[PDB]
Design a protein around this nucleic acid. Structure first.
Lengths: 129, 144, 155, 17, 150, 81
RNA sequence: AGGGGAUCGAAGAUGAUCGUCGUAGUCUUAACCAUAAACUAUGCCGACUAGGGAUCGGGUGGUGUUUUUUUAAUGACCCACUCGGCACCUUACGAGAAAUCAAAGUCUUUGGGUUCUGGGGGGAGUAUGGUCGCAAGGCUGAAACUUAAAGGAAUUG
RNA sequence: GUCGGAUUUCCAACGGGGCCUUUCCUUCUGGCUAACCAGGACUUUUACUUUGAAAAAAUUAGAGUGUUCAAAGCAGGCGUAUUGCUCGAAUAUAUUAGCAUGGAAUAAUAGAAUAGGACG
RNA sequence: GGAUAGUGGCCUACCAUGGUUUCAACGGGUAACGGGGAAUAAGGGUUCGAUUCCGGAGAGGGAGCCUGAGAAACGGCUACCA
């Protein structure tokens, strides 16, 4: 029962961030993991990463630079209104002025600080600070 | 997965687990059993009032071994018979048998002021004349 | 079932105040009164052309359709000329921040213009209170039975 | 032996008190 | 893993990365399709057939060489049986266990294992009676499985 | 540790891994071309048989199954292809 | 309820400052009963993060040794590697109240999925009601009441 | 270039919308040679979320206002107060359910295997 | 079909065998009139709401009815019970 694949990815990236491995191998990556790691890559949290192709799973090796503290995942993925990202960026980021609660909209996977600007909101996914 | 089910459509089992586990506290059992209205001789009230049956005295718990001078009240609104403490020293001479005392509990939800084995209510007012003021000699107590 | 030779009760079923003329025998040789119920629900071809009566049908009968238009998935249809749909949905609890499933068993009148089998995704419309529990009426059937006719001819 | 003695509405019948 | 036991084992077939190609392989589909209908008229099961073509002749996965899996070939050529292969073997096992349990009733262990086997039959049947590769209201049955297998 | 390619492991190190647990999984089993002794019809036999592979030319045993690789027989020289 | 009934042997005999017999039983066919310190006192799935050698089961290499008709395969070894299993051992990276733990870790940097249970101690696994059992009893299981502690780990003369 | 400010641009960052790349973004109908509404099938249905309408007053948040202050109240300010003028009683929240409207990734569901399947 | 101001098992006649349910029916309890609200103020909640507004229900207990547009009216009537 791998239930949430993104949860296993982010777990592995924590466990091999704490212990200073500069690269990891996650499995069995999907679109959502690519989008999430693009969001983390965009604000400079992790380095370049790379999708291998077997015909089935799609493992990924992520080179990670070590700027990451913690990447999380919020199971279950709750529905979050625009009024709510106040209450999510106050539970689970360390300060007001960094970190990103990322969340899934219909406009596409995105951190909250852009989600205010395009002014949509959907479900939540994890969090990176 | 930390016990409880965190699933997004699993609210029912959350609130039904909770309702099963609220019958674990004391106070929530008190409310919904209606224990304040069945037992507990003040029938869900702060105070009550009653007729003094007789004046007694104690031989309480160790180390404080003494005779502490309680009384016997029969309440009016129930016919229950509950023992009662008279406050500040003296004041057993203020009450008599067959007088009208107003009771209230000690402040523990029942049990004790201290060593006292099974006395839970203090007397606030005899004959409507307010033991604080009698003990401080501010009013007087007519008989009956 | 109802089984056309429709006149099977102790009275004469009819479209009321719709008059065949016995003296004038002309090119019709059949007269019914159908109405489009509205809201772009197509009246069926079995309504206009069949011989049933159904005073509570929304196409031949006196009742009319307004108010709520609901859908549902049909469950037991043992009653005569009426069915029960199951109108399921998610409830929300704000405490626990999650949801729960809930269902309603709405009973609902069906015309014999529709062939409703158990496990159809039906669409109902609100009628006038047509029995004790019935308030609704079937307006469109969109049955998806997984091609169970030829289900025995398989790999 | 029989000691249910619970869940009663005739409580109102304690108006006889 | 291991639906009924406490085992964990990983034991399998790493199908390769190519989709066409052996690239050393002989002529064509008509040869292998002809082989498949040959064995199917002989009366084998698609598991056995993929095995027998694997080792005897030179084929890899038939999907690579042909355009279709084995089961689709015996479907298209009209020899795909009424029950699929696996549920057939399960009912077969339950019949064997059942007969052994008829003889030796004081046994507890084959009772327990039979109760596992029938569980697996129920799970597959309930998979098959959704996708209608069995007709619905077909139920595995404990008295007349012996006629149901044959 | 701390740092290494997972993308380009040395194939010496990658030979020892279980077939699944490589970077991209693959089989380790080869096909081979058996030359029957008394005849000419060369047969291609998968290295893990499960069956007594009949030589078709002369109807005889080529290789016997075991738990593992297909145990061959008398001096039928085989080519790994 | 039979059948068997050797040993041992609940209950039943004998002795100044425990021993001898011994039915019920243990044994078995057919029924019940559903308890245990039924205890690795540690739910079940799933992923990831440290080494060590040990062996168990299978498998892949070693012109590695023996052994056989030292000729071949085998068989037993020896070495390497890998998959699954039972465990040890070592750090303390983390965890913890601590003892300790590769998991009791990745849980205030507080969300992989799910089942059950507890919410100070006695009153009490009692009372009552069902419910199952031929019975013994099992399951479920309060309250009034009383109490300021009851309990865990570890150090010290 | 007004001298606390934009007007022209530079330059990126932010947002949108089309257009082209194999990329349907409905066929059919008069106002017409689709800009427009009426007019036929539906283009599975959902869940979610943005926006809008609905969301009695009072209470709550809160704008203005020297009730002598404050709680309050919705009043009041302003001239020759000599025949008057005049400002204002905002705004916001208001779960969920219904309704209308975006968005189309997340989570589901159907679309062609006995082809009784579409363009014929 | 009756009845109603009017749809309707609302009621009668005939016919059929259904309708709700562990997504918790039904039954029990409520020292339960329902809301708008109130108390407690990190967030999330918990506890209360007889009580100024809206809505229902009752006028000792049940029942019936007159009159009227509107009453099952009680600062109207009739009977029975207390």
């Amino acid at each position: 029962t791998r239930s949430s694949v993104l949860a296993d990815a982010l777990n592995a990236i924590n466990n091999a961030e704490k212990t200073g491995k500069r690269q990891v191998l996650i499995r069995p990556s999907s679109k959502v993991i690519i989008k999430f790691l693009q969001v983390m890559q965009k604000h400079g949290y992790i380095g370049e990463f790379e999708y291998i192709d077997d015909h089935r799973s799609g493992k990924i090796v992520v080179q990670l630079n070590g700027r990451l503290n913690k990447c999380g995942v919020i199971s279950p993925r709750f529905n979050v209104k625009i009024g709510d990202i106040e209450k999510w960026t106050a539970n689970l980021l360390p300060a007001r002025q960094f970190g990103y609660v990322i969340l899934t909209t219909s406009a596409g996977i995105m951190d909250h600080e852009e989600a205010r600007r395009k002014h949509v909101s959907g479900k939540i996914l994890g969090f990176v600070y | 997965g930390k016990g409880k089910p965190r699933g997004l459509n699993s609210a029912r089992k959350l609130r039904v687990h909770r309702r099963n586990n609220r019958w674990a506290e004391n106070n929530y059992k008190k409310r919904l059993l209606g224990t304040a209205f069945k037992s507990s001789p003040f029938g869900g009230s702060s105070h009550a009032k009653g007729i003094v049956l007789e004046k007694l005295g104690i031989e309480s718990k160790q180390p404080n071994s003494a005779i502490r001078k309680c009384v016997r009240v029969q309440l009016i609104k129930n016919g229950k018979k509950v023992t009662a403490f008279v406050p500040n020293d003296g004041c057993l001479n203020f009450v008599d048998e067959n007088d009208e005392v107003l009771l209230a509990g000690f402040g523990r939800k029942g049990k004790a002021k201290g060593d006292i084995p099974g006395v839970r209510f203090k007397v606030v007012k005899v004959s409507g004349v307010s033991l604080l003021a009698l003990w401080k000699e501010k009013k007087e107590k007519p008989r009956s | 079932s109802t089984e056309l030779t429709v006149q099977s009760e102790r009275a004469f079923q009819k479209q009321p105040h719709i008059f065949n003329n016995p003296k004038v025998k002309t090119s019709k040789r059949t007269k019914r009164w159908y109405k489009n119920a509205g809201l772009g629900f197509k009246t069926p071809k079995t309504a206009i052309e069949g011989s049933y009566i159904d005073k509570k049908c929304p196409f031949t009968g006196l009742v009319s359709i307004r108010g709520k238009i609901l859908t549902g998935t049909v469950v037991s249809t043992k009653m005569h000329r009426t069915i029960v749909i199951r109108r399921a949905y998610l409830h929300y609890i704000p405490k626990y921040n999650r949801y729960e499933k809930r269902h309603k068993n709405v009973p609902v009148h069906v015309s014999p213009a529709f062939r409703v089998q158990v496990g159809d995704i039906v669409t109902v419309g609100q009628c006038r209170p047509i029995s004790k529990t019935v308030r609704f009426n079937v307006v469109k059937v969109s049955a998806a039975a997984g091609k169970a006719n030829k289900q025995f001819a398989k790999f | 032996p029989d000691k249910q003695v619970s869940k009663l509405q005739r409580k109102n019948k304690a108006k006889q008190l | 893993g291991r639906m009924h036991s406490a085992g964990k084992g990983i034991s399998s077939s790493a199908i390769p990365y190519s989709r066409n190609a052996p690239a050393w392989f002989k002529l064509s589909s008509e040869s292998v399709i002809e082989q498949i209908v040959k064995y199917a008229r002989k009366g084998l099961t698609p598991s056995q057939i993929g095995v027998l073509l694997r080792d005897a002749h030179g084929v890899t996965q038939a999907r690579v060489i042909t355009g279709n899996k084995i089961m689709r070939i015996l479907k298209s050529n009209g020899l795909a049986p009424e029950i699929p292969e696996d549920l057939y073997y399960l009912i077969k096992k339950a019949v064997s266990v059942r007969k052994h349990l008829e003889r030796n009733r004081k046994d507890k262990d084959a009772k327990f294992r039979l109760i596992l086997i029938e569980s697996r039959i129920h799970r597959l049947a309930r998979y098959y009676r959704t996708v209608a590769v069995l007709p619905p209201n077909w139920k595995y049955e404990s008295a007349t499985a012996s006629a149901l297998v044959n | 540790v701390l740092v290494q390619d997972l993308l380009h492991p040395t194939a010496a190190s990658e030979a020892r891994k279980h077939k699944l647990k490589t970077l991209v999984q693959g089989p380790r089993s080869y096909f081979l071309d058996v030359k029957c002794p008394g005849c000419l019809n060369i047969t291609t036999v998968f290295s893990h048989a499960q069956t007594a592979v009949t030589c078709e030319s002369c109807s005889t045993i080529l290789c016997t199954p075991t738990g593992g690789k297909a145990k061959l027989s008398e001096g039928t020289s085989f080519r790994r292809k």
